[PDB]
């Protein structure tokens, strides 16, 4: 199906912010001569939301290989339809991105914003969004589960009721980025202005252990792709057949040699081992 338009350009015309100052600064495009408190409290409601069934479809980015998702489609304010140059779709698990960019093509940073808002950081592979300003009721866990299950695929939902805060950990960083951009300033079953940011590192040592274990699991996956399966078996040594191949091949003739790991696993065309 073609990508449908979500709203119309008659209300996607470009115009100034409402006047909160004496004079409009044309360099920074901001109002001046006013106050600072107004800006702090003012956080309005979102002007739209998107639907996988109704809105998500095909476009010139589905034609063009290796392009990005539409941030305005994620926000539900994309009037472009089929003529948008960015994908109108939720990322699957096969949608991966490099650390320098996010799923919307916006550059990622070495740091975080001091309010943990924005694009994110390549110095931390964060898949956990932080949803605050939730109306505290008893069905909040059901509502959070329903809406964020609609927004992607979840590894861990942790909703606190005291302060009304849902920490959602997706299994894809692109899913986390899409969920943050699609749930910021939107509302659950009650009319509320959700504060969807990047979550901080979890001080729970169980979560620290599982995050570290996932880091070594991903890294060891990369190592095992890099190395041949037979060096993998010999180095792992969980089974006695590869263990005895390890002793024999490291012996290279002589009894009781036990070749250095560097010599035995030095990969190359013609180094020592025929496994190379």
């Amino acid at each position: 199906r073609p990508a449908r338009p979500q709203i119309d350009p008659a209300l996607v015309k470009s115009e100034r912010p409402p006047q909160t100052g004496t004079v409009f600064n044309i360099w920074y495009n901001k109002w001046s001569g006013g106050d600072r408190e107004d800006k702090y409290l003012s956080q309005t409601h979102a002007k739209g939301r998107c639907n996988i069934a109704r809105d998500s479809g095909y476009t010139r980015a589905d034609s063009r290989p290796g392009s990005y998702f539409c941030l305005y489609f994620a926000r539900g304010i994309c009037p472009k339809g089929q003529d948008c140059d960015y994908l109108h779709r939720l990322p699957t698990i096969h949608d991966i991105f490099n650390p320098n960019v996010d799923c919307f093509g916006r550059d990622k940073f070495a740091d975080y914003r001091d309010d943990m808002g924005g694009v994110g950081s390549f110095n931390r592979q964060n898949r956990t969004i932080y949803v605050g300003r939730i109306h505290v009721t008893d069905d909040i866990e059901e509502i959070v589960a329903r809406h964020f299950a609609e927004w992607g695929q979840i590894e861990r939902i942790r909703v606190l009721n005291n302060r009304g805060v849902a920490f959602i950990t997706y299994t894809n960083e692109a899913n986390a980025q899409f969920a943050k951009e699609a749930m910021a300033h939107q509302s659950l079953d009650h009319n509320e202005i959700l504060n969807v940011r990047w979550a901080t590192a979890d001080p729970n040592p169980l979560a620290q252990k599982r995050e570290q274990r996932r880091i070594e699991e991903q890294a060891a996956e990369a190592i095992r792709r890099a190395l041949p399966a037979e060096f993998v078996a010999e180095i792992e040594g969980k089974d006695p057949e590869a263990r005895k191949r390890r002793k024999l091949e490291s012996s290279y003739g002589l009894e009781g040699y036990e070749a250095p790991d560097a010599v035995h696993f030095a990969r190359g065309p013609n180094a020592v081992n025929p496994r190379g």
Partner: protein, 161 residues
């Protein structure tokens, strides 16, 4: 011979005046957030604004011309319009033209009853600048200062003076 640099080379052409007109009309006062990526260059072209002032003021029309068209070199931002001309004249012709201005102006100053000098500044401080397309583009110009030449006596310069 046509690709003696790897590519087919052509002369730089002139664009339509409506292209430059559309560029300056769109950017306007540089107030819409679309034009930030232009803002750094626009303000950067301030360094070259003195050339634009000299080129415009030296290619200004003479009192015997109602209007003059000039070649301009313009930035594609709409930041800098440079009159790319030199006001080259035949010195005897330019002498005769300004001498005829001297005589015509003296006759008009003897014949006018009251000379109302035009105001300075011609426009108000807070009055926004006028538009080529809505205020000047197709407007009928008044008569320039021109001597009534002689069909017989000034026959030799009559058609082209």
């Amino acid at each position: 011979e046509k690709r003696k640099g790897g590519f087919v080379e052509t002369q730089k052409a002139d664009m339509p005046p409506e292209h430059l007109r559309k560029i300056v009309k769109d950017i306007g006062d540089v107030s819409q957030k679309k034009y930030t990526s232009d803002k750094r260059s626009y303000l950067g072209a301030l360094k070259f604004m003195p050339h634009a002032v000299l080129k415009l003021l030296e290619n200004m029309p003479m009192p015997w011309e109602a209007a003059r068209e000039v070649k301009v070199l313009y930035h594609v931002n709409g930041c800098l319009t440079l009159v790319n001309e030199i006001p080259r004249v035949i010195e005897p012709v330019f002498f005769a033209q300004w001498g005829s201005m001297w005589r015509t102006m003296r006759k008009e100053k003897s014949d006018r009853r009251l000379f109302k000098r035009m105001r300075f500044p011609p426009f108000d401080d807070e009055e926004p600048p006028l538009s080529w397309s809505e205020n000047i583009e197709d407007v009928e110009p008044l008569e320039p200062i021109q001597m009534e030449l002689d069909e017989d006596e000034d026959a030799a310069v009559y058609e082209w003076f």
